[PDB]
């Protein structure tokens, strides 16, 4: 019973159109919820609500405070690669090197003479979009939380890297942790425990992959 | 009750030999548990399990989420001494200067003209093993947590500094916090509430100092 949403509705602006209308779902401990939908459906807004950045006008949200959020939009702080990944968290080599492996970063990092000690600027203009996205995801999965909110992390990644990361990181490395993935890929949806399809703030579908297949 | 392990067994590699075999212990609030053993016994692995970095194949582990971990292997991030000690933790002068004093760092820091504003590199190559170990322990004790996991912090320290740190930091500064100290020293074991002795993944002894003395 890790994440629970009951008749939840919220608005970004008072008196406006609700960004999310009567949202219901229950994600059990260690399950994978896939959040699909059209552009502007309210997917990020739903994650913003779980984070407490969006307050519901009506309904109730229940979860344990330990949340790690991966943005759609990569952000890299000034400092080394290691500084960016480990961040506020303490350093454990097994966890660090396992996360690098899972997030397809080992080859890129080893290409540099200074390895993880290479200094990045702000925004990581030196790195590629994919390298930036991988560092951002690595940082998020390196944070030890009870819930992982991954908002479209594979957006600027090639299909081959995305396949490796989804299989070895989202599915293998984070297997026992409750996680919410914003994705509209069938390839990802097949591996989901439950699927939420949003369209214009409303829940168009909620159920298993087999239930979605039967439509 | 703060930390409990009942019939806990875990493996690093599937189908291998278990790293920890049938581990049982209950550490009450504010108690000091000493974890002793031979090299390769599974001490670090036990702490890793408390962290969630090692998943048990069998058994149950219970504790409150607020954990501060001190590694066997000192790690230094690029930045100042102050930056390294307050690792993303809010700054309080009293706590800061009290932790420095307890961890025998004041004299070393005051030797530098720039004091705690001196810039360190990654791995603290500029500092001695003892200085690196002290900064790592300071960082860990500066973090306000319910449970403190101190994995062999005195390993690269001289017996005189270690005596001062154990007495004024582990025993005085952290006096009413639940602490798990990985140590094989009788001098430290006499001050422990409970003692766990590991040998090749197995619990060879579990009990009080008086019980250990009577063997």
């Amino acid at each position, epitope marked *: 019973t890790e994440v629970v949403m009951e008749n939840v509705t919220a608005f970004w602006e008072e008196g406006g159109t609700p960004v999310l209308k009567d949202i219901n779902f229950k994600i059990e401990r260690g399950q994978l919820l896939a959040v699909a939908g059209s552009t502007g459906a309210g997917k990020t807004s739903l994650l913003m609500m779980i984070m407490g950045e969006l307050e519901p006008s009506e309904g109730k949200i229940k979860h344990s405070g330990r949340i790690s959020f991966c943005s759609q939009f990569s952000w890299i702080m000034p400092g080394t690669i290691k500084e960016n990944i480990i961040f506020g968290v303490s350093y454990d080599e097994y966890r660090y090197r*396992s996360v690098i492996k899972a997030c397809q970063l080992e080859e890129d990092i080893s290409k540099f*003479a200074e390895k993880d000690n290479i200094v990045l600027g702000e925004g990581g203009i030196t790195l590629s979009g994919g390298q930036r996205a991988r560092i951002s995801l690595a940082r998020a999965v390196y944070k030890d939380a009870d819930l992982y909110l991954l908002d479209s992390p594979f957006g600027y990644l090639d299909v081959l890297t995305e396949k490796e990361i989804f299989e070895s990181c989202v599915c293998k490395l984070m297997a026992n942790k409750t996680r919410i993935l914003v994705t509209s890929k069938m390839e990802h949806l097949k591996k989901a425990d439950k699927i939420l399809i949003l369209h214009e703030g409303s829940s168009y579908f909620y159920g298993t992959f087999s239930e979605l297949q039967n439509l | 009750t703060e930390v409990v392990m009942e019939n806990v067994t875990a493996f690093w590699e599937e189908g291998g030999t278990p790293v920890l075999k049938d581990i049982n212990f209950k550490i009450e609030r504010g108690q000091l548990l000493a974890v002793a053993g031979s090299t390769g016994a599974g001490k670090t692995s036990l702490l890793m399990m408390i962290m969630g970095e090692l998943e048990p194949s069998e058994g149950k582990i219970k504790h409150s989420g607020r954990i501060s971990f001190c590694s066997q292997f000192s790690w230094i991030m690029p930045g100042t001494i102050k930056e390294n000690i307050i690792f993303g933790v809010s700054y309080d002068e009293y706590r800061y200067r009290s932790v420095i004093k307890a961890c025998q760092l004041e004299e070393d820091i005051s030797k530098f003209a720039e004091k705690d504003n001196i810039v360190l590199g990654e791995g603290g190559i500029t500092l001695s093993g003892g200085q690196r170990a002290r900064i790592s322990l300071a960082r860990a004790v500066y973090k306000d947590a319910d449970l403190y996991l101190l994995d062999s912090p005195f390993g690269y320290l001289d017996v005189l500094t270690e005596k001062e740190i154990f007495e004024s930091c582990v025993c005085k500064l952290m006096a009413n916090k639940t602490r798990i100290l990985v140590t094989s020293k009788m001098e430290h074991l006499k001050k422990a509430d409970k003692i766990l002795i590991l040998h090749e993944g197995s619990s060879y002894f579990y009990g009080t100092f008086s019980e250990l003395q009577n063997l």
Partner: nanobody, 123 residues
Framework: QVQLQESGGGLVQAGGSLRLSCTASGRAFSWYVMGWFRQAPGKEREFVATVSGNGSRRDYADSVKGRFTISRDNAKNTVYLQMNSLKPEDTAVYYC????????????????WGQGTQVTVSS
């Protein structure tokens, strides 16, 4: 990316002891998983012992377990191999190697290699 040089080899009588050293010249020594490998005359390079960049993980070949000890000093950019209670089987050229990938004891995963040192254990 890292240049390795071994030392400490030579002739020893069985039951004896020998300590090998390996200094690495290059950036980010701590990133590399260091390993000791032996090549017996006519045989392939076999894994002996490995150490993670941190020094947190140490693994040994079944044959050397309990007799050999691998250690690291990241401040001195050196890796050591303490070979106690030597048998004539241990006669081989001992190589020191660095791997830029995490946790493999297979020599195929090690990119940078040293010149090697001959170790001879007389019966």
């Amino acid at each position: 990316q890292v240049q390795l040089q071994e030392s400490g080899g030579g002739l020893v009588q069985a039951g004896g002891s020998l300590r090998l050293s390996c200094t690495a010249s290059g950036r980010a020594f701590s990133w590399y998983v260091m390993g000791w490998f032996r090549q017996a005359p006519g045989k392939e390079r076999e894994f002996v012992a490995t150490v993670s960049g941190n020094g947190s993980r140490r693994d040994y070949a079944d044959s050397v377990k309990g007799r050999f000890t691998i250690s690291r000093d990241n401040a001195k950019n050196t890796v050591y191999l303490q070979m106690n209670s030597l048998k004539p089987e241990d006669t081989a050229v001992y190589y020191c190697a660095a791997s830029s990938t995490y946790y493999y004891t297979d020599p195929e995963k090690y990119d940078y290699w040293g010149q090697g040192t001959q170790v001879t254990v007389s019966s």
